[PDB]
A paper describes a structure:
At the core of this natural phenomenon lies a fundamental process of energy transduction by luciferase enzymes that convert the chemical energy stored within the ground-state substrate (luciferin) to an excited, emissive state of the product (oxyluciferin) by a spin-forbidden process. Although beetle luciferase systems share identical substrates and chemical reaction sequence, they emit a range of different colors from yellow green (λmax ≈ 560 nm), which is typical for common firefly species, such as the North American firefly Photinus pyralis (GPp) and the Japanese firefly Luciola cruciata (GLc), to orange and even red (λmax = 590–623 nm) from certain click beetles and railroad worms. Here, we describe the first crystal structures of two rare WT luciferases from Brazilian beetles that emit light with exceptional colors; a luciferase from the head lanterns of the glow-worm P. hirtus (Coleoptera: Phengodidae), the only known luciferase that naturally emits red light (λmax = 623 nm; REPh), and a green-emitting luciferase from the firefly A. vivianii (Coleoptera: Lampyridae) that displays a blue-shifted emission relative to common firefly luciferases (λmax = 538 nm at pH 8; GBAv). Biochemical and structural analyses of the two luciferases, combined with computational modeling, provide the best insight yet into the relationship between the structure and color of light emitted by beetle luciferases.
The crystal structure of WT REPh was determined at low resolution by molecular replacement from two different crystal forms in the space groups P1 and P3121 at resolution of 3.05 Å and 3.60 Å, respectively. Unlike previously reported luciferases that are exclusively monomeric, in the P3121 crystal form, REPh exists as tetramer, although in the P1 crystal form it is an octamer in the asymmetric unit. The estimated molecular weight (MW) of the wild-type (WT) REPh from the SEC analysis was ≈ 240 kDa, which corresponds to the tetramer found in the P3121 crystal. Only one out of the four C-terminal domains was observed in the density maps of the P3121 crystal form and none of the eight C-terminal domains of the REPh octamer could be resolved in the P1 crystal form. Only molecule B of the P3121 crystal form has enough quality to trace the C-terminal domain that was not traceable in any of the molecules in the P1 crystal form. The C-terminal domain showed higher average B factors (69.4 Å2, with several regions with values above 100) relative to the N-terminal domain within the same crystal form (60.3 Å2). The aperture of the active site with an angle of ∼125° between axes crossing the center mass of each domain (P3121 crystal form) shows that REPh is the most open conformation among the known luciferase structures, which corresponds to the high mobility of its C-terminal domain. This feature indicates that the flexibility of the C-terminal domain may play a role in tuning the color of light emitted.
Author numbering:
A (entry chain D): 8 to 349, 363 to 436
B (entry chain A): 6 to 349, 363 to 437
C (entry chain C): 6 to 349, 363 to 435
D (entry chain B): 4 to 349, 363 to 544
Write the structure that this text describes.
C-alpha cells in the first residue's frame, strides 16, 4: 500500500490545477529567471500567455484528436504553450532539442503532431526536419515578439485569436476525465532498441503534484524563495520536477546545461534554497575541487531522481554542504520517476511469486512490481509494448525479487 | 448579481472535518501549534491531530451521531479544538456556549440545541454541573483541560483511553463522509435583531469556504506557514472560532491570549514575534490612540485585520501608520453568519440591490436594499422555522439592512449610500 | 549683457535626438527606467531605446518627415517617451496636447499645428476618436500603452512590427541629422499674454541646452546616475515635460505619479526611496504646512526644486528646515518657453535691463525693463508671426514685463526693483 | 573594404582639444575636495586646486613665450602635482615629454635629445639629477620644480613662476584654453624602446586622449564607478598606460588616491584604509593579487571593479583573482600597441581592425587566417623626428601591423580570436601553423609543446616536434607522426621525427625561444 497522501490529489484536469495555481500566485514577479541571459518572466505573465494561447490553439482548430509538440532547449517561455495544451487537453509531445535530423524524424513519427512550438535556436533545425513531414502543418516560435522570416511566433498567433480585453481570470480550462485524457507523449529510448513513445495521463501529473506538495518527501520550502532547475525540460524527470514547482509558487531560476562550474556561480548568486539534479551533478557536488570556493550556504534541500549510486556520494554531499540528510529515489521509472523512497502516496507495491503469480504477504520473496495511477497509461500507437510493460491488471513488472517488509515496517527491501 | 472575486483556491468539496484532518496530518511536524500566552502551556499540531482523532473514535463508540448534538463550554483554552474538530470528523453538530453566560441565560441557550453531551473547561465545570441539574437531556460532561477526572466528572483523557489503546494511529483513522452542505457543523447561538436566544445553523460547506478565503492571498492572511499569528477573539463566538480554526489548514504557529485587557497584548506581540493579528475594534482603538504602545517592539507585525464593528472614522488609518503595516484592510460588512464577506464581494459570495418597493434585481449604479447570497451563508435558525424564512428569503437571499447600488461591472465592489 | 554662468558641460552640438539616443544606448543597462507609481508597471531604458528606434524607422517608412507634425495626447504614462523621442530622432515636430482639454478646446489646439498622426493613451482614445471625427487632416491614431489593437485602432507595437522585423538592432540605427536650431522639436500650445490659442515653437537647441542645465552640478539635480527621482509634473506641459526628459541624459531611475493630489505623493516618496522631487508650488504648500506629513518617512530626500511662479516667502524655508535638505533653491524666473533661467542667470542665458523709455542698454544696479536672450528661447509662435515679433523684439531679446537691475559685475545675479 | 569596425561608442568623442575637455572637467568637478591623495605622505590636493594651478601655469607658460613649436618636458615620480604642468601644456597645445624618473644620465640624455624640450618641469627628488643632466644640454634653457613652495638654489618653482604672471585675483573660470585641431597637434611625446633597439619617441595626438576618455566613460568597458568615489592609481605616470589611465580619471571626477611604487603589501593597506572602489594595475600585482598569502588579512570589501592593462597573465591569474576578491569579473584587452594600450578587450570604440594576407595584403573575410592589423585615431601617430620608424610601424594608410595572425569570429559577431601570436614563427614550404593550430590541438598523453622548424631539406623547411612526457609513458617518434598524420593531412607531421626531451624552453611564463628547440633538436637527432 504505501504512505497515506497528506495533500489529497486534485480530482480535476491537471490543466485546471495549474491554471488555478498560476492565478493564485500571479503576484509572484520572479516566476522564472534565465540564469544565463537574465531574462525574467512573472507568474502573471505565464498565466496570461497560457490562457491566450489556449483560446488560440482552440480557435485555430485543435483538440484531443490532435497532438502538438515542442522542441526547445531549457528556456523561459517553454511553459506558456505546454500549460496551454494542458488546459485544452490536447496531448503534448516534447522533443529533445539536440536530436540529429535522423533521430528527430523517428521521434515525430511516433506521435505525429500537427503543430510545433520551438526555440529561436531550434527553429532552423525544425524547418529542416519539417520539410520531410507532410503532417507538420504549422511551426510557432515561443521566445520571440517578432516573426522569423514568415515563421509565426506565440505573440502574433495569440493576437490573431485574442484581443485587448482578454482576461485570463475569465478563461476556463476545458474539463475531462483526467485519467483517460493524455497530457504528454514523451518518447523514451530505454529498453530494447525501438524509440517507443510513452503516454502520460493527467492523473499522473496531479499525483506528481501531490508528491511535490508532501512535506516529508517533496521539497518543503517557502512559497517565495528561489529554487534551481537544471534538468532537461523535454525529458520526463526534468519536465515534471520543474512543472511541479508551480502548484506551490516558487521563484524558479534555471540553467540551460549541467556542464561545468557556473552551476556554482549560479547557485550562490541567487540564494538557491533547494536544487534537484541527476547524479553526475551529484559527483561534481561530492568529490569535485574548489566547490566550496563559492558560498553555497544557501542550500536547504537536495534531490536526486535518476540512477543514484551508493549512499556514500550521498553522504559526501550531505556532509559537504550541511544538509538534512539528502534522501531520494530507488526504482524510478520510464514514467513519472521516483516512487518508494526516503512506497509513496498513490503507489501500491506487491511481491507475488516467480512461479505462481499470486501475491504473497510479509517476509516472502518473489518478483516485486508496481501499481499506480501515476504509472504510464502504456505506450503510443504500439499495443505491443503496452501489454508488454504493465501486465494483466495494472502491475508493472520491475524485474527484481525481494519482500514485503511487514505491517509495522511497510517499506521496501529486495533480495535480488 | 455582483458575483465578487473568482476563487484562487478551489473550495475543498468534502467534509470540513476531512480538510481539517488532512491539514493537521500535513502540518504534524509543526511543534508550537498553540501556545497559552498565560500558562506557557503548549500543544503541537501532531498532538491535536492525535487527540482529535482519538476523541473522534471515542465519541463514535460511545454511541453518538448526526442525530445528537454535543456542546463545548470553555474560555479560550488550548484544548478547545480537541473535541470540536473531532465532532467535525464524525459530523456530529457542535453547539458552542459562551462561558460567561448567567445560569439564566445558559439554560435558555442549551434548550435551543438540547445537547446530550457537554465538554467544558475546568474553571467552567462548576457552573456546568450547577446548570445540568436543570436539564434532563444533558446526560454527560467531560473536562477538556485536565489529566485527572474531577470528582466523578470524566476528563477527555480518561474518556479516550476507554475506547482506544496505546497503539492507536491517527494516520489510519477516517473522518466520516457525508454531504458537506446538508450536515450541520455548528449551532452557534446569537440573540440579534429581536434579542431572543436564537441559534444559528452552519453547514460544513460554510467552513470549507471560509478556509478558501483564508488561503486566498489577496484577502485572507498571507504569511509563512510556521510563523506566529495571535488570535485572541473569543472562541465560542463565530469571529474568534472561524478566524482561529482557519489557521490550521495553512499551518501557523498560533499564540492565544485569554482576554483583551490593557497591555500584555503589547508585551506578547513583542515577546513572540507576532507576524499577524486579527482583533475586534476595541483593541483597534487601543492600538491607535493609546500611548507608549511604541514602548514595546511591535516591529514583527506584517498584517492586521479587523472583523466586527469596524470604526471607519479613520482609527484604522492611524494604526496603519503607527505600525508601518501594508495598510490594514478588513470589515466592509460581516454578519451573524460566518463573518467577513466583501472586503478590501468575496469568493463564493454574491450580493444584490433589487429595490425596497418591488424587489426586482437592480443593475449597475442603482440603489435599493443590499443583501447577500452564498453557500457560506447560514443555513438558518434551529428548531425555529419562523425567523429562518424571515432572515433568508424565498431563494437564498439574506436581507442585510442597507441600501447601496452595485458599483458597475467595471468596479465590481460595493459602495452603499445610507447605514 | 549679464551673460550668466559659464557652462560646466558644453552643450552637445548635434540634434537633441542624437543626444537622447546616445543616452538611451549608454544607460541601457538600467532596468528600472520608468515606474508607474500607481500600477507598478516598469519600463527599462533599453526597452525605450528599442521601442523608440523601431518607432522612428516606422514613422519614417510610413512616409513622414519634418514637413509633417505629429501629436501625442496622453496622461502621465510610462510609454509617453516612446514616440516622443522617436520624433526627435527623425526631426519631425511633436505637438503636445494636454490630456484634459475639452473637445471644444482640444480642437482649437489641434488646429494650430494641424498634425496628421496622433499617438494617444488607452484612456485618451475615446475622446480622441471623438475629436478626429471633426478633423480631415488627422489621418491616423496610434495607442501607446497597449500590446494589442483596440477596436480597429492600431497600437505602437503593431505599427512598429509593420516596418521593422525580428533582427532590428537599434545600436545600428542612426538618428536623422539636421541643424538643431532650425529644426523644430516641439510645438507646445500655451495660453499666455492673451486668452488666444497660440502655439510655441521649441528648437532642438533649446532641449540640448536644457540637458546642459540638468547635468550641471550646481544647478540641475546633482545625484548619482542610478538613484530614484520623482516626476509628477504634467508631461504634456513644458515644465513637466522637460524636467522629465532631461533625466535620461543623466540616467536616473524615474518614478512617476499621474496626479499630485493627496498623501499618495507622501506614500510614493517613501516607498520608492525618492532622492529628489521637483514640484510646482501647490504640493510645496502641502509640503511645508500640511499635517502628519512626517508620519511618513521622508528621510530619502537630497534635493528639492520648484518651477511654477516661485515666491512662497518663506514657505520654501519652512520645508528646507522641515525636511533636512541642503536648502531648497530654485525658480526665480520661469516662462512660456523652457521654464527656469536664472536660478539659485544660468548657462547660455543672458539677461539685460535697458530703459522703459529709450530701450538703450543700462550698466550695473540700474532700473528699466528686464528681458532675456538665449538659444533656449522660443523660436517664436507657430502660424502666428504677429505675436512672434511681439514676444521677442528686433534682435532676439524677449521682454518679460518686469523692471529691476544688475546686482553688479562683482555679483552678476538678479534682483529686480 | 572588409573591416571589423568595432563597438559603437556609448559616448561620442569630444570634438575639440584634449585640453578643453580636461578644463571643463576640472571646472565641473571643482567641488570634489579629495582630487589626488598621496597614499604615502597624506598630502592632498583638490580638483578646483588643480583647476587653478593648471590655468595659472597655462597663462604663465604663454606669457613666458611658449607655443606649439616648442616642447616642454617633465621628469617626476608619481606625485600629486604632476597634472598641473601636464594639463597646462594640454591647455596651451604645447607638446609634452614624459621622461622616466629613474633613467641614468646616459639614457636620459638620449631621451631628451629626441624632443629637445626647452622647459623642464621636475620634482624635488629629481632635481639634482636633472641639473647634472642639463649641464650637457644647451637646448634645455629653464628648469621648474613642481612640488615645492620655495625655489631651490635659484631653481624656480611652479609657484614663483606662476606668480610672476598671475596675481591674487586670477580666475580660472575666465581662462580659455587655446583652440586647434585635436588631431594634428601633438599632445605627448613619450619615448619607448625595446623594439629594434634604440631611443625612439612616440607621438600621441590630442584626439588619442579624447578617445581614451571616451573608453574610460564606457559603462561596459572603462571603469563605471560613481563620480566622487575613491580609485587607486599606482602605475608610473611617466609611461603611457599609467599616465592615461590616471589622466582619464578626471573626466569622470574621481577621488584618486595614488601610490608611488608597486612593491609589497603597502598596497593592501591603502586599498583598505581608503575604502578603494576600483583599481587598474599591471600583471605583477595581478599575480601577487591571486597567488600570495594573507592578502585576505586586510579587508578588501570595497572592491567593485578591477582592470588590467599590460602583458596579461591569461594563464589563470585573472580567474583566481576575480574569485578571491569577489569582483564583477576582471576582463581586459589585447593589442599592446605600445602607445595607448588596450584595443580589443573582454574591437573597442573608435578602433577598427582587419586581417590581411600573409602574401597579398587584401582584407580577408570571417574565419580567414592572416595578419591582424588595427587602425584607429587613438593609435600612436608616429615617432618624433624620425621618418624611418614611422613608415615602418604603420602602413600606407594608418593600419598598424601587429605581426600576429588570426581571424574575426563573425560579422554577426565581430570578435577577433587569433591563432598564432607571432608571424616570425611557424614557417614551412607553403606556410604552416605552429604553437596553436597543432601543439595545443593534440595531447594524448599530454606531451608539452614542440613546433620549431628544421632548415633541412634544402627542399623547404622541416617542421619537427620536441615532445616531453611526464608520468613515464612510452611514446615513439614514429608513433606520434601517425596520430597527427590524420589530424591535419596534407603533409605536416614532423618530417625529421618527434624528438623527446625534459621540459619545454625558457622565456618569461610561456614564451619559447624557438631557436632553442631547433638547436636542442640538433643534439637529440643522435642516440637510440
Amino acid at each position: 500500500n504505501g504512505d497515506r497522501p497528506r495533500d489529497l490529489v486534485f480530482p480535476g484536469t491537471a490543466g485546471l490545477q495549474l491554471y488555478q495555481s498560476l492565478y493564485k500566485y500571479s503576484y509572484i514577479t520572479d516566476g522564472i529567471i534565465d540564469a544565463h541571459t537574465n531574462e525574467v518572466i512573472s507568474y502573471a505573465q505565464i498565466f496570461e500567455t497560457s490562457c491566450r494561447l489556449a483560446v488560440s490553439l482552440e480557435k485555430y482548430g485543435l483538440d484531443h484528436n490532435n497532438v502538438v509538440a515542442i522542441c526547445s532547449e531549457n528556456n523561459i517561455h517553454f511553459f506558456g504553450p505546454l500549460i496551454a495544451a494542458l488546459y485544452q487537453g490536447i496531448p503534448m509531445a516534447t522533443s529533445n532539442d539536440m536530436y540529429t535530423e535522423r533521430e528527430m524524424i523517428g521521434h515525430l513519427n511516433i506521435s505525429k503532431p500537427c503543430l510545433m512550438f520551438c526555440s529561436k535556436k531550434s527553429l532552423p533545425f525544425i524547418l529542416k526536419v519539417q520539410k520531410h513531414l507532410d503532417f507538420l502543418k504549422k511551426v510557432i516560435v515561443i521566445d520571440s515578439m517578432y516573426d522569423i522570416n514568415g515563421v509565426e511566433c506565440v505573440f502574433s498567433f495569440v493576437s490573431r485569436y485574442t484581443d485587448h480585453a482578454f482576461d485570463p481570470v475569465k478563461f476556463n480550462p476545458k474539463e475531462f476525465d483526467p485519467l483517460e485524457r493524455t497530457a504528454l507523449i514523451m518518447t523514451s529510448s530505454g529498453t530494447t532498441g525501438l524509440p517507443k513513445g510513452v503516454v502520460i495521463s493527467h492523473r499522473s501529473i496531479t499525483i506528481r503534484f501531490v508528491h511535490s506538495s508532501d512535506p516529508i518527501y517533496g521539497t518543503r520550502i517557502a512559497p517565495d524563495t528561489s529554487i534551481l532547475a537544471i534538468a532537461p525540460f523535454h525529458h520526463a524527470f526534468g519536465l515534471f520536477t520543474a512543472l511541479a514547482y508551480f502548484p506551490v509558487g516558487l521563484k524558479i531560476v534555471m540553467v540551460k546545461k549541467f556542464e561545468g562550474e557556473f552551476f556554482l556561480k549560479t547557485i550562490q548568486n541567487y540564494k538557491i534554497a533547494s536544487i534537484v539534479v541527476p547524479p553526475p551533478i551529484m559527483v561534481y557536488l561530492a568529490k569535485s575541487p574548489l566547490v566550496d570556493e563559492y558560498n553555497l550556504s544557501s542550500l536547504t534541500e537536495i534531490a536526486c531522481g535518476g540512477s543514484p549510486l551508493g549512499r556514500d556520494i550521498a553522504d559526501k554531499v550531505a556532509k559537504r554542504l550541511k544538509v538534512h540528510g539528502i534522501l531520494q529515489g530507488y526504482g524510478l521509472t520510464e514514467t513519472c520517476s521516483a516512487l518508494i523512497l526516503s512506497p509513496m502516496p498513490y503507489v501500491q507495491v506487491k511481491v507475488i511469486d516467480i512461479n505462481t503469480g499470486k501475491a504473497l504477504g510479509p517476509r516472502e520473496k518473489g518478483e516485486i512490481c508496481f501499481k499506480s495511477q501515476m504509472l504510464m497509461k502504456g505506450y503510443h500507437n504500439n499495443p505491443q509494448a503496452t501489454r508488454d510493460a504493465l501486465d494483466k491488471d495494472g502491475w508493472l513488472h520491475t524485474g527484481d525479487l525481494g519482500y514485503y517488509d511487514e505491517d509495522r515496517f511497510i517499506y521496501v527491501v529486495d533480495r535480488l
